[PDB]
Amino acid sequence: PFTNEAHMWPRVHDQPLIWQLLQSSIINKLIHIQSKENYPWELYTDFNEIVQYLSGAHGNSDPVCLFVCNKDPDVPLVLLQQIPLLCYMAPMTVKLVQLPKSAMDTFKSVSKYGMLLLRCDDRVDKKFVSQIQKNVDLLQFPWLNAIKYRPT
């Protein structure tokens, strides 16, 4: 397939309340100040920055993770149509993650746009993503299979 398996990645139900907890950590990090924001934690919230970080400029850290809000009406579907392809072709192990909450547009209301590119080297990032790689890992290349484009 090309997109038939692409929008709906996750099939689990244990995370959402702890998703709320990490969102609370996000607002905790957003409270302090512009510099206190970005000094200890590797966060990007600018589409141009998302592209330039995955372009291949710096290759230091392997585990990179994106968090985007999707599959809810009236969103830039045409524009996030190309971000999973970028997350796959990127040489870094980039785990695209999708907010399964249509009501979680407060993310869109808080930082910039409803997406967040993070680089997992903090040990709490280790703690919470080493348990989510157990949970969700779904990323393929359409050029490989191309068996179910969209028949019947």
Partner: protein, 104 residues
């Protein structure tokens, strides 16, 4: 020709065209990309079937016909870059010297 056997032939031909659209050279060479794009579209126009818009919009280019792909099988990236808006968000390619603009 059986129509039940013709449906399978149609699916197989569409899959074959879509696979020929891909592998190495249609990504590399703009000529083969455009030719195979035209062939696939002339083949899908004859079957009286519409194609999905979610792919129709952001699939190929308008000047050459290569798939918009940024950086199992390592290949060449399709597009020069993809900026932010900067006034309006655009996408540029490698093969040709043009860009495609979209507004929010």
């Amino acid at each position: 020709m059986n129509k039940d056997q013709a449906e399978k032939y149609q699916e197989r031909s569409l899959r074959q065209k879509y696979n020929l659209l891909h592998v190495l050279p249609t990504l590399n060479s703009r000529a083969l990309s455009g030719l195979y794009y035209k062939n696939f579209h002339n083949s899908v126009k004859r079957y009286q079937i519409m194609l999905p818009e979610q792919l129709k919009s952001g699939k190929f280019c308008s000047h050459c016909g290569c798939v918009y792909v940024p950086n199992g099988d390592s290949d060449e990236l399709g597009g020069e870059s993809m900026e932010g808006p900067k006034k309006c968000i655009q996408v540029n390619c490698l093969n040709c010297e043009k860009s495609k603009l979209f507004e929010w």
